[PDB]
Design a protein around this nucleic acid. Structure first.
Ligand SMILES: [Cl-]
Ligand SMILES: [Cl-]
Ligand SMILES: [Cl-]
Ligand SMILES: [Cl-]
Ligand SMILES: [Mn+2]
Ligand SMILES: [Mn+2]
Ligand SMILES: [Mn+2]
Ligand SMILES: [Mn+2]
Ligand SMILES: [Mn+2]
Lengths: 93, 107, 98, 84, 92, 104, 97, 78
DNA sequence: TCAATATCCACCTGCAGATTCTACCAAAAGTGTATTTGGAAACTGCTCCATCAAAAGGCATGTTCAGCTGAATTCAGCTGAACATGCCTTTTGATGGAGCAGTTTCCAAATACACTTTTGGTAGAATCTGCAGGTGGATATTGAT
DNA sequence: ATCAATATCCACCTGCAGATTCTACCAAAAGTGTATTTGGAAACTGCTCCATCAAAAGGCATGTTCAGCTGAATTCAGCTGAACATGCCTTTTGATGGAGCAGTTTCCAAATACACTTTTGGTAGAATCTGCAGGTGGATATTGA
């Protein structure tokens, strides 16, 4: 019956910005719903973006262009920087 | 060769592997690139950092150390961008921003 | 005897409820309304209390928002008292009708 | 069980007044209370109808919070706080 | 390249109005319409299956999707034609 | 000997099936799903065309143009609700003038 | 010398335009505007003719609708003359603001 | 360029909208709403253009943008 | 009502821009097999939902009473409609040229796969503690004089 | 401008309901060695997408008049807010019984995989055609008198 959640990571990220703060469980589930929601919106747009350009594979480029569509810059412009960053760091194996 | 989590290889807190799986099992496309789960885990991580930063402050302001729903609301609604992003979202137990139209005040 | 003028407690109440987040409709009556509507839709149904709570949170978030808009239509008509015609215009413009 | 009737009246004048307050409303016309019950009933019927549809499709007899969340999402009124 | 339901729409046009024709724009509009509803029903069907952890979109998912998407009487008749076509088909 | 003719339809049952698989909607697609979905699509198409045809007729026309599709949709509550967030290019609007704005 | 009373030609125009479907904005100025805006997003762009047409269609349908709602707000305030205050209210209730 | 959208043009739109009397200030208000609308739509369209690695905005780029804004347009490829 | 503008409104009429109609080739669509396997059916372990009981007080009901708000009227300043002029910018109709979507043709970089070890997480026990609720003076905030 | 009357604050307290940690697996990431593709990269077209040219034709920009619409100013019936007295019925706590989710297994009917074999659907000319766009000539619809 084990079920997956983002709680673990949401909490880690919480400790990073505000080391002193905690979070009630309602707040946490709320936060969970937010993560799975934007994941759904990004993925879907990514999915469609891939279709339009006759591709059967969703690259980091589809995610990027999707992010630019769903988010309002500034939020967009900063999300794209972090994504580019995390990827190149990754490609540096 | 020791195990190096992709999250760490990417410099992230969010679960790159998990995200990579949710992608292949979500019927979003035939195949998923290696970078895809990394870029998404980053964005998803950037955003939750952004709302927790503001939520935590709304908490501090209201003299509490634990973040609750109402703090998430003030954080979301008082931020133009987060507000637009979550424009059609209702946060349970979040209440509303205190706001009274001028015409209504004692003359 | 002391007596606040009409409008002062009303403003007090706005400040008070805009500050809080608890549900404003009573639990039991609402649970009933849900069971009554659901039942006249499909018999032998059951609800997780969680499910009834999700419906109450949504209905209240919805009625409260409809009243913000209703209030703007009232004001716009140079009034301060909301009326049915105000709720109807907000719903018309919102697309909940035409 | 017991027969269910007129439960829409379980939505009192004071509960509607409170909702108007949180919505920032200062003065309420006598007719608002019945328009509100009418409006609330339509809203609830639609969400319950879709929710019970997700339930039947899952061959269940119990409406779960998820059915409601999904119903609400269909109507374009996403809810956070019950996804688990 | 570029396939459309254009041809299938014209046949249907001739059944209800053998007498009537149809402009170019009107035809593309009916084409956008078919692809749109096709996408709404299929998508809702996709989710419905994932809610029940099923790997296949059966006519049961198509029907619920229809019930969720088509309003009132449209949904009813849509559902009637639907199961009817699945019957005159499973017959051989 | 096509599944369409077999199901008694004018719509491409075969294509609807291919479009369901290539659509990334699910791992597997049931045999009947494309038949059903194809039936639903044909029916709604017949519905609109049926009403659009009537709109043309009344306009003293034999060819259905965009305006006719618009008149058929916006004058039917069910279709209007379904296509509530859709604009028909070159379809115009329904003639309707608010009472108050009338003379005298 | 003949002269129709104020508002009579307005009604005449309403009936005419609610009866047709032709675009009401001049095709050329619109196209100029569309490219001006686009240049601000990506320089040196080409536009399929139909791309510009799709945009004018949506753009005009959007405005016509907004004017319907705006007119309702003006009527709601016991008027017959639409005002910015009316466009603003409609856009607010609509969620565009 | 926004002035290209002229008073008479706006009156016409309003008329189709069923508007009888138009306040003198509606013309400038309209141009502003129209430019925000176009900016949003084109911005998304052009994003679709760039993703497809083209230099030409196609009608489909506009059709997909409109759907993203919840303004589905029929008769141009969807 | 009388009369004089302009507006609409059928009935016919003649081509031109589209439609509908034809004549053909591939790429889906139907097939005959040979496999995979998804998930309906069959249990049954056990959370959770429907109920019941009882007591307590937070709150919904009803009724009084009169402040001040919405609805009616009036009246006139001036904004926005109707128009005749005068004139500029949109149409539109080929020509020609050229940027460039759309197609092919490769294939090396990048993925999907199939197994095999290794952890990273999730499900409860075991521990910790913000803060919900109560109290009480300190301070306004209102509203009558 | 005073002040009574009341409501709003804010710091001070203290158990315990709701977080946090501590532990243990075990389902699923990370590690590697193959069996396929894919998505880009060049190369070339044939499209259609600018650019001009260049008249005519409306359709837009002004300036005039003044009709009638929107406010501003006044009133007043009575609607709807503030308070009070009553006592109902929603809350809160606890405890069950068993309806019916959920978790596992079992395994055929059903869907996926080739490898082919036809047939149908998209193309680009060929053969008609529905309405537009005029043209009157005839009742309307407006509006001044
Ligand atoms: Cl990638
Ligand atoms: Cl009313
Ligand atoms: Cl099936
Ligand atoms: Cl204004
Ligand atoms: Mn009582
Ligand atoms: Mn008043
Ligand atoms: Mn005057
Ligand atoms: Mn470990
Ligand atoms: Mn053929």
């Amino acid at each position: 019956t084990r079920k997956e959640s983002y709680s673990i990571y949401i909490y880690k990220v919480l400790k990073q910005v505000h080391p002193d703060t905690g979070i009630s469980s309602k707040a946490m589930s709320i936060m969970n719903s937010f993560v799975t929601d934007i994941f759904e919106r990004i993925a879907s747009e990514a999915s469609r973006l891939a279709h339009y350009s006759k591709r059967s594979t969703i690259s980091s480029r589809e995610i990027q262009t999707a992010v630019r569509l769903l988010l309002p810059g500034e939020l967009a412009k900063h999300a794209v920087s972090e994504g580019t960053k995390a990827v190149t760091k990754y490609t540096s194996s | 060769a020791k195990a190096k989590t992709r999250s760490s290889r990417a410099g992230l807190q969010f679960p790159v592997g998990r995200v990579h799986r949710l992608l292949r099992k979500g019927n979003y496309s035939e195949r998923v690139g290696a970078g895809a789960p990394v870029y998404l885990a980053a964005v998803l991580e950037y955003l939750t950092a952004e709302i927790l930063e503001l939520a935590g402050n709304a908490a501090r302001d209201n003299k509490k150390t634990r973040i609750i729903p109402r703090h998430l609301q003030l954080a979301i609604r008082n931020d133009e961008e987060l507000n637009k992003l979550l424009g059609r979202v209702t946060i349970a137990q979040g209440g509303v921003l205190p706001n009274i139209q001028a015409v209504l005040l004692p003359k | 005897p002391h007596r606040y003028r009409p409008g002062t407690v009303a403003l007090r109440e706005i400040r008070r409820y805009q500050k809080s987040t608890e549900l404003l409709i009573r639990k039991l009556p609402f649970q009933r309304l849900v069971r009554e509507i659901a039942q006249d839709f499909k018999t032998d149904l059951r609800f997780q209390s969680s499910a009834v709570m999700a419906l109450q949170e949504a209905c209240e978030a919805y009625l409260v928002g409809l009243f913000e808009d209703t209030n703007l239509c009232a004001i716009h008509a140079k009034r301060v008292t909301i009326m049915p015609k105000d709720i109807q215009l907000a719903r018309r413009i919102r697309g909940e009708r035409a | 069980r017991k027969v269910l009737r007129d439960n829409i009246q379980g939505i009192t004048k004071p509960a509607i007044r409170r909702l108007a307050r949180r919505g920032g409303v200062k003065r309420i016309s006598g007719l608002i209370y019945e328009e509100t019950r009418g409006v609330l009933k339509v809203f609830l019927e639609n969400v319950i109808r879709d929710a019970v549809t997700y339930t039947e499709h899952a061959k269940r007899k119990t409406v779960t919070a998820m059915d409601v969340v999904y119903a609400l999402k269909r109507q374009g009124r996403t809810l956070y706080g019950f996804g688990g």
